[PDB]
Design a protein around this motif. Sequence first.
Motif, PDB file in Angstrom:
ATOM      1  N   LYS A   2      -0.667   4.132  -0.668  1.00  0.00           N
ATOM      2  CA  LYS A   2      -1.146   3.726   0.650  1.00  0.00           C
ATOM      3  C   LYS A   2      -0.012   3.255   1.536  1.00  0.00           C
ATOM      4  N   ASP A   3       1.225   3.548   1.137  1.00  0.00           N
ATOM      5  CA  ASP A   3       2.399   3.136   1.902  1.00  0.00           C
ATOM      6  C   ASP A   3       2.037   2.909   3.365  1.00  0.00           C
ATOM      7  N   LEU A   4       1.367   3.895   3.953  1.00  0.00           N
ATOM      8  CA  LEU A   4       0.937   3.796   5.342  1.00  0.00           C
ATOM      9  C   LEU A   4      -0.583   3.843   5.477  1.00  0.00           C
ATOM     10  N   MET A   5      -1.267   4.355   4.457  1.00  0.00           N
ATOM     11  CA  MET A   5      -2.724   4.450   4.496  1.00  0.00           C
ATOM     12  C   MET A   5      -3.359   3.089   4.763  1.00  0.00           C
ATOM     13  N   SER A   6      -2.847   2.058   4.101  1.00  0.00           N
ATOM     14  CA  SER A   6      -3.364   0.707   4.282  1.00  0.00           C
ATOM     15  C   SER A   6      -2.816   0.079   5.563  1.00  0.00           C
ATOM     16  N   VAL A   8      -2.733   2.043   8.518  1.00  0.00           N
ATOM     17  CA  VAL A   8      -3.419   2.700   9.625  1.00  0.00           C
ATOM     18  C   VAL A   8      -4.852   2.189   9.777  1.00  0.00           C
ATOM     19  N   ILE A   9      -5.571   2.107   8.661  1.00  0.00           N
ATOM     20  CA  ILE A   9      -6.953   1.641   8.664  1.00  0.00           C
ATOM     21  C   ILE A   9      -7.037   0.131   8.880  1.00  0.00           C
TER      22      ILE A   9
END
Length: 33
Positions: A2-6, A8-9
């Motif tokens: 989720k490097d960036l997944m967590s 963005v959301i």
Amino acid sequence: MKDLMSLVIAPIFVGLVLEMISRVLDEEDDSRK
């Protein structure tokens, strides 16, 4: 991962909610039909 997944959301959340109420603060009339 989720490097960036967590990332963005996460923001979009507090940003979409805080807005939902921000409208109620001044959501009197939408439009006259």
